[PDB]
Swiss-Prot record, chains A, B:
Keywords: ATP-binding, DNA replication, DNA-binding, Helicase, Hydrolase, Nucleotide-binding. The gene is MCM. Changing R545A: Loss of helicase and ATPase activity. Changing T359E: Reduction of helicase and gain of ATPase activity. Inhibited by the cdc6-2 protein. The ATPase activity is not stimulated in the presence of DNA molecules. Belongs to the MCM family. It comes from Saccharolobus solfataricus (strain ATCC 35092 / DSM 1617 / JCM 11322 / P2). The keyword Protein biosynthesis does not apply. Residues 276-480 form the MCM domain. This is Minichromosome maintenance protein MCM. One of its GO terms (biological process) is DNA replication.
DNA sequence: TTTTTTTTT
């Protein structure tokens, strides 16, 4: 038996990273400066430094975590006495446990160990307080004594009151003292297994987890997470008998991850190539032949524009795309790829969606009997991409409910005496089919779309796809068979790198409008408005929302190349793609 | 007087199997490799070796079973001393009990003996944990003692706390320690009697079964199982008085089997026949005369293609068949046969089904008032075949809800704040009648089918059946009367053998496309588009989906012969069969 | 009652 306090402190102060910069030393300095009261330690670093220490942490986690926390607290206090009186104690969290078990394969033998489960967050409860050291008061004409009922022991999960007053050795009734009671933050969350690991013909399972102290509010619903901790059984009503000798299992979260310096370096060198825009476009849906304009348009929606917020109003900075085409034109394949490449995307269908399920659901809690809101599909997709397949197959009554969300990016709910406004800053991608299944050349655009002009004006770009057999049939057949044969096209950025590239660009890039683009946009907008009045029978209208599109598209083009200003070249690209949108629908230039 | 501990040991190690290889020794050796912890014993094997032990097992199971487990553990321990500290005990499961009782014939005299029940699983609860050895601490300021209350006795299904502390002989308050508590896996399932056993008029009855230890998650809902164990009465609140001395019956499962190496050699022998494809086609619906092209198409759907999973998207590998015919053409006859020979099939009707029930339904459980997902018809058919009879009779607004599942093989639900995706990789076979009941040659094909072009393109093959009274009436009449007279057709593979053949092919066979097949497929696909453009009047469209139909059919043809490569011969059959399909819908090539 | 999805007069 050898003390690990010296080894743990030595590991923190002597570990060398990639550049031998003592990374953990900097984290401690950040912890001291910010009073973060929590430290994250990578498991492989501990294993590389000393494999014997790693095994004790994995196995004897129950009794070794407080030892390391106490030793670390002394080191922090030695480094800076001012850290005291602000943080009572620190927490050590281990990340990178080699023991990973699927949510569906949890057995009795795994209870009481430190295991890691990766899943999807579903529900998060509001933060609440849990008592871990109570202070009762035996009220009785002779007692007038207060005491901490749990002696040299933490208050268990089941609340219990003293039976005999220790100060007097007599029975009676006891009163809790909130002022001297010690509390700890407590949150309840529910995790779900990934759809790619669910067995065939079975519904996904769910597991409930506990977040405490600083771990609260570490994630939002719909985010892939990785958690590590100790499993335990759950007790709800143990006071009254009636068998129920079967208990569930809940997880005590110790370390939580969501979804680096080296990644930024990899991303930065990509933008050095002048042809970065073409590479990104060619990397969208590599298994789909042709549709270069559609592929180019989808890339703009992934990056999006720059939202503008003023002292009196705000302007949306998202691009909405509507695609209409004949069946079999691979409209859904691109949408599925978007949902798999975007950092945050939600995939829905017209028939499988409802008005309540798309914006906000008002439900009544049976335990409380009061109404409370539930996040809709658009709300969960805030700051991301919203995909609505088969937009024409949903009822118009439910479809018209998203008019405010598509433009104002807000959802107003006035039901059951509850009034609220929720942010819905998401870009909507919709696909559908013409009124008669296939597009009819002889019939005009009005009866083919079969959609009200109001919703059409909210779409920045509208593309019409036509399945016309011709000279491209032979090359299309070869491409499809190559995909089925396993052959793939190289010189394509992988999905993981592309997803990282999109996330980085949306966070650290904000292009500015220059004078050259201002003149180019104005001339095109005025000229295209003049042609609109020539043929006012088209279902589409050239509204001021169209002028908004050029600014957003130009910003998206600049954001693609990690630029800082909208140059003259970007304005030309925005005009070129805008012309194709007008040309496809039936408006000549 | 006589001990069976040594009797069981020699039976395991000295028992000549069918091939005289000591199969039970191999099973024990296989058990050690992966720590199976469960050994399956055939009742016939015990009866063949020593009849005396057979009666003891079947009549005194509750006593002799633990004794045999101890003997087996020592034998395994000697073979592998390392078997300790991972598997503390093993289990002995007995199958093939001759005592089989119908679910409706259970009486009081059937309680307490080992019986076998055949039925259909309908509900599986999530895996939970049951306490069988608790650990309590007496909360009395003088005690501080830890003890296991269920001493010298397994903890009953009704949880009970001690009234007097064993180590101090005093009453008071007791607390349970989860860390020192011993748990065991516990799962609840519901079984239903087969439709062939339900008597006239009444609805089928249900029985509750309990699965423990490794038996959890041994089967999925909708499967046919054969459970074996001891019946017992169910109690919830025995303390709660107020009459009601009537108790239900719950089933304690000890061994469950769902639905041998001799099958593989028998299956391999069948595939060696060069005319295996013809024999399989002739073995589909032996009671139906004619319809050779329809029989061949149905065989392809049973086997199906090879799904492709890529890093970005996935390609559907199932084949969908649509049949349109006049009444009396026995369309529903093969559909019933398909649902009987397929390893996993679900039979539905257009009128008796709704959109919610087809894919997924969101229902509110009154126990908690919270919405939860319910598996639909397509979800439960994942990995199998879904049959939709009388598709034309059902509502159009309900038919559009399955467009996504038939191509993307996924179901998306956004209702009441619930967003999820479910896999629905199931082949769809549909039948229906024309617009005016009978087919009319004077009217064009477009208005006769009366279906939207979108759903028509999804189907791989569409066959139109016409009832023309000709010279074949006498031949058809004789065949029908022969069936009614008890005469049957010989030299046909039985359903039991055919079902085994199909299951083996779909698992261990994965054909690949060759260069020769690519040229034939590409040339014929181009011919479709050229012919289709020449006649823009047919309601069917030659979309790129038809190209995948050639690939899927070619793979299915190769899979029927247990081949690994799709040769030119398979490609020619794929081209030939679709030529008939095009001819049926009035397209001549 | 009121809001939600569902099958049903
Ligand atoms: Mg689609
Ligand atoms: Mg019929
Ligand atoms: Zn007192
Ligand atoms: Zn005691």
């Amino acid at each position: 038996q050898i003390d690990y306090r010296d080894v743990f402190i030595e590991f923190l102060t002597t570990f060398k990273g990639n550049n031998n910069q003592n990374k953990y030393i900097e984290r401690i300095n950040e912890l001291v400066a910010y009073r973060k009261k929590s430290l994250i330690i990578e498991f492989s670093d501990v294993l590389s430094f000393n494999e014997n220490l790693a095994y004790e942490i994995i196995n004897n986690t129950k009794i070794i975590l407080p030892i390391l926390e106490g030793a670390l607290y002394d080191h922090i206090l030695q480094l800076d006495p001012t850290y005291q009186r602000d943080i009572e104690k620190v927490h050590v969290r281990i990340v990178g446990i080699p023991r990973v078990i699927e949510l569906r394969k949890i057995r009795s033998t795994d209870i009481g160990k430190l295991i890691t489960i990766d899943g999807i967050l579903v529900k998060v409860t509001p933060v609440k307080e849990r008592i871990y050291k109570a202070t009762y008061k035996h009220i009785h004409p002779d007692c007038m004594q207060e005491f901490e009922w749990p002696e040299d022991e933490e208050m268990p999960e089941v609340l219990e009151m003293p039976t005999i007053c220790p100060k007097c050795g007599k029975p009676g009734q006891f009163r809790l003292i909130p002022e001297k009671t010690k509390l700890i933050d407590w949150q309840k969350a529910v995790i779900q297994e990934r759809p790619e690991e669910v067995p065939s013909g079975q519904l996904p399972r769910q597991l409930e987890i506990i977040l405490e102290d600083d771990l609260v509010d570490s994630a939002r619903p719909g985010d892939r997470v990785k958690v590590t901790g100790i499993l335990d059984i759950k007790q709800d009503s143990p006071v009254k008998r009636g068998s129920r000798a079967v208990f569930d299992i809940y997880m005590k979260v110790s370390s939580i991850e969501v979804s680096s310096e080296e990644d930024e370096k990899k991303i930065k060198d990509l933008a050095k190539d002048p042809w970065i825009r073409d590479r990104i476009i060619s990397s969208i849906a590599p298994s789909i032949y042709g549709h270069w304009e559609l592929k180019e348009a989808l890339a703009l929606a992934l990056f999006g524009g720059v939202p503008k917020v003023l002292e009196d109003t705000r302007i949306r900075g998202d691009i909405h795309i509507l695609i209409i085409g004949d069946p079999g034109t691979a409209k859904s394949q691109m949408l599925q790829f978007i949902s798999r490449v975007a950092p945050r995307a939600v995939y829905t269908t017209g028939k499988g969606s409802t008005a309540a399920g798309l914006t906000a659901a008002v439900v009544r809690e049976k335990g409380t009997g009061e109404y409370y809101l539930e996040a809709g599909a658009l709300v969960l997709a805030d700051g991301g991409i919203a995909v609505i397949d088969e937009i024409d197959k949903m009822r118009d009554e439910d479809r018209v409910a998203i008019h405010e969300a598509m433009e104002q990016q807000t959802v107003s709910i006035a039901k059951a005496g509850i009034v609220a406004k929720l942010n819905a800053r998401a870009a909507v991608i919709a696909a559908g089919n013409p009124k008669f299944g296939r597009y009819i050349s002889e019939r005009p655009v009005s009866d083919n779309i079969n959609l009200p002009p109001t919703i059409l004006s909210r779409f920045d770009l509208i593309f019409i796809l036509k399945d016309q057999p011709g000279e491209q049939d032979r090359e299309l057949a070869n491409y499809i068979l190559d995909v089925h044969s396993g052959k793939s096209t190289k010189n394509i950025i992988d999905i993981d790198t592309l997803r990282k590239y999109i996330a980085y660009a949306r966070k650290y890039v904000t292009p500015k409008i220059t004078s050259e683009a201002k003149n180019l946009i104005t001339d095109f907008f005025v000229e295209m408005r003049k042609k609109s009045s020539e043929t006012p029978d088209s279902p589409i209208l050239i509204t001021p929302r169209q002028l908004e599109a050029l600014i957003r598209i130009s910003e998206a083009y600049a954001k693609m190349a990690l630029k800082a200003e909208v140059t003259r070249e970007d304005a030309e690209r925005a005009i070129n793609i805008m012309r194709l949108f007008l040309e496809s629908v039936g408006v000549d230039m």
